[PDB]
Amino acid sequence: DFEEIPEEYLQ
Amino acid sequence: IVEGSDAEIGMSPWQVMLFRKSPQELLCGASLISDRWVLTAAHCLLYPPWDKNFTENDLLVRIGKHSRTRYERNIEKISMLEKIYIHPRYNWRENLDRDIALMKLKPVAFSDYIHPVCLPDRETAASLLQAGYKGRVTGWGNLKETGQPSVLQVVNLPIVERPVCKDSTRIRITDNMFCAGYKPDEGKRGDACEGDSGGPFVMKSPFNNRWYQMGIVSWGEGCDRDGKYGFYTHVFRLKKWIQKVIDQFG
Amino acid sequence: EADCGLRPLFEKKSLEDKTERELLESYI
Ligand SMILES: *[C@@H]1O[C@H](CO)[C@@H](O)[C@H](O)[C@H]1NC(C)=O
Ligand SMILES: CN(C)S(=O)(=O)Nc1ccc(Cl)cc1
Ligand code: NA
Ligand code: NA
């Protein structure tokens, strides 16, 4: 449902 | 938000979305109170009856948003949490008394879309927290009890007399709560709904033309039901705790 | 913050949002 957010915020 | 409307751009620049990292999903609303501090409901972070007890690394906050689901490149900012602080007397066992929590963020850069809300002083609270006076609730929660918005929704709702709040529910209401919403006979409608909790109830002071966060979306029984009201954490009543946390850990 | 509660796209520019007047009218 949600657009993927930049990987940098999941590190 | 039920029976609200789309927010204008920059209408609620203190709005924050509490976002679960995995699975990626909306958890709650929240609000920006400084460049490093976000205010939300304790139950957004801790609710043992539903096996909810988030740690800092489970979560992100997304600030500056308008679209619910879009990654708003060059507009929103996404922040990691340094620390969660839950009110030590938050009552998750019974009635969500003292439903308040703080999250310390790196500072977020302010912009046209990102700006903190004020917290009330005693006098602004005494003056504005009166039955019939309206505040404004914002969020990305569901559009009805029984679906989901494209963009941030807004609704303005009147504070309700305490006996009417109490008489609408079997839950024990405390001084750390207030309720808001229209009465069945008032015609107009509107309420928070699932996904809005933790977000702000704000009022624009007519004295100094600033927005103050008087409430946090705390709980309700269904959404927008006739004869029911939304319940909000009384921010001013808990402000000494807020200040203690920010003074100690800020 | 000294600047809290003043929105860049509204108060800072002396522009009113579409429904803030409803709030003001309730403050009687
Ligand atoms: C929630 O999680 C923290 C950390 O794991 C834990 O220490 C705390 O006791 C938990 N709180 C409740 C009410 O379970
Ligand atoms: C009943 N809730 C879980 S809900 O669907 O989020 N509805 C609701 C309604 C009002 C308020 Cl303040 C908080 C929640
Ligand atoms: Na009752
Ligand atoms: Na209602």
> What's the level 1 CATH class of chain C?
Few Secondary Structures
Name the shape of chain A in a single word.
Answer: elongated
Structural class of chain A, please?
little secondary structure
Largest sheet of chain A: none
Task: Give the full name of the CATH homologous superfamily of chain C.
Answer: Thrombin light chain domain
Spatial shape of chain C: flat
Task: Provide the CATH topology of chain C.
Answer: Epsilon-Thrombin, Chain L
Q: What's the short story on this structure?
A:
Chain A: Residues 1-11 have a biased composition (Acidic residues). With 11 residues, chain A is largely without helices or strands. Helices cover 0% and strands 0% of the residues of chain A.
Present the secondary structure layout.
The complex is a heterotrimer of chains A (11), B (250) and C (28).
Chain A: no helix or strand
Chain B: E1 5-6, E2 15-20, E3 25-32, E4 37-40, E5 46-47, E6 52-53, E7 59-63, E8 77-80, E9 83-86, E10 101-104, H1 122-128, E11 134-139, E12 153-158, H2 162-167, E13 177-180, E14 200-204, E15 211-219, E16 230-234, H3 239-249
Antiparallel strand pairs in B: 1-12, 2-3, 2-7, 3-4, 4-10, 5-6, 7-8, 9-10, 11-12, 11-14, 13-16, 14-15, 15-16
Chain C: H1 20-26
Bound molecules: 2-acetamido-2-deoxy-beta-D-glucopyranose, ((4-Chlorophenyl)sulfamoyl))dimethylamine and sodium ion (2 copies).
Task: List the main descriptive attributes of the protein structure presented here.
heterotrimer, B: 250 residues, Thrombin, subunit H, 7-stranded antiparallel β-sheet, 3 helices, C: 28 residues, Epsilon-Thrombin, Chain L, 0% strand, binds 2-acetamido-2-deoxy-beta-D-glucopyranose, binds ((4-Chlorophenyl)sulfamoyl))dimethylamine, binds sodium ion, Thrombin light chain (chain C), Hirudin-3B' (chain A), hydrolase
Write structural notes for this entry.
Chain A is mostly loops and 11 residues long. In chain A, 0% of the residues lie in helices and 0% in strands. Chain A is elongated, with a radius of gyration of 7 Å. A seven-stranded antiparallel beta sheet of chain B has the order 1-12-11-14-15-16-13, with no helix packed on it. Chain B has a seven-stranded antiparallel beta sheet with strand order 8-7-2-3-4-10-9, with helices on one face. Chain C has one domain: Irregular (Epsilon-Thrombin, Chain L), CATH 4.10.140.10. The A-B interface holds A 1-6, 9-10 and B 21-22, 24-26, 60, 62, 69-71, 78, 80. The complex binds 2-acetamido-2-deoxy-beta-D-glucopyranose, ((4-Chlorophenyl)sulfamoyl))dimethylamine (Y4L) and sodium ion (NA) (2 copies). Chain A: Belongs to the protease inhibitor I14 (hirudin) family.
